[PDB]
């Protein structure tokens, strides 16, 4: 009876509406106010300035 582990290599794949059994493990569920980029991974969204 093994206790064994893995990992999620990337977090830059976004939101999906498919049932959980047909998705990739990479695809997320809900993403709000994030800016997923391949340079820095997942980061908070940039701010908005006033003019």
């Amino acid at each position: 009876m093994p206790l064994i582990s893995s990992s999620i290599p990337n977090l830059i794949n976004g939101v999906s509406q498919q049932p959980a059994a047909l998705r990739l493990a990479s695809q997320a569920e809900e993403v709000i106010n994030c800016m997923p980029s391949p340079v820095e991974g997942l980061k908070k969204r940039p701010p908005m300035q006033h003019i």
Partner: protein, 100 residues
């Protein structure tokens, strides 16, 4: 795979240059739990008193439930930066028979 029993035990996050974020784990029909983290490691002199903290390291927290009855949410509301690289989970695995 969908049938074999995969019970989650611990959840880990790897970050970099992150000041603050929080985790909100809710098992099946039970109370919600929180696990805030804010960079300031007591005893370490890398961040003196009076300057913002931007750390680099790994974080671990137990989930203790079954894979089909969990909500794991990464939450943050501070005005300080937060960026995350990857995550890794660890759980218990059973196969009631052998695999063709």
């Amino acid at each position: 795979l969908a049938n074999p029993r995969l019970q989650l035990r611990t959840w880990s996050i790897v970050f970099d240059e992150t000041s603050n974020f929080s985790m909100k784990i809710t098992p099946g029909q039970r109370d919600e739990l929180t696990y805030p983290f804010n960079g300031y490691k007591i005893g370490s002199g890398q961040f003196p008193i009076g300057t913002p903290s931007l750390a680099t390291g790994r974080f671990r927290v137990p989930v203790m439930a079954q894979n089909i009855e969990t909500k794991i949410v990464l939450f943050s509301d501070s005005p300080l930066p937060c960026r995350v690289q990857s995550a890794e989970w660890e759980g218990w695995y059973q196969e009631r028979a052998r695999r063709l």
